[PDB]
Amino acid sequence: VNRSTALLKSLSAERERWEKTSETFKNQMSTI
Predict the structure, then answer these.
(1) DSSP summary character for residue 29
(2) How far is C-alpha 31 from the chain's CA centre?
(3) Measured between alpha carbons, how far is 21 from 19 in angstroms, rounded to an integer?
(4) I need a surface site. Which of 3, 15, 24, 25 has the fewest CB within 10 A?
(5) What angle do CA 13, 19, 23 make, to 5 degrees?
(6) What is the dihedral of CA 28, 19, 14, 9, to 10 degrees?
(7) 3-class SS at 15?
């Protein structure tokens, strides 16, 4: 299941990227 664990951690990093994108987009939605 090591391949699955690697996919899981890569997708968690992707989720962190999604969170930061959502945070900056909420900043823009607040300042609009």
Answers:
(1) H
(2) 22
(3) 5
(4) 3
(5) 150
(6) 170
(7) helix
Query: What single-letter DSSP state applies at residue 26?
Result: H
Residue type, 32: I
Deposited experimental method: cryo-EM
Please report, as a single letter, which amino acid is at residue 16: E
Q: What is the dihedral of CA 25, 28, 29, 32, to 10 degrees?
A: -160
Q: Which tokens hold the place of 7?
A: 């996919």
Which pair of tokens denotes residue 24?
């900056």
Resolution as reported, in Å: 3.5
Tokens representing 30?
């607040």
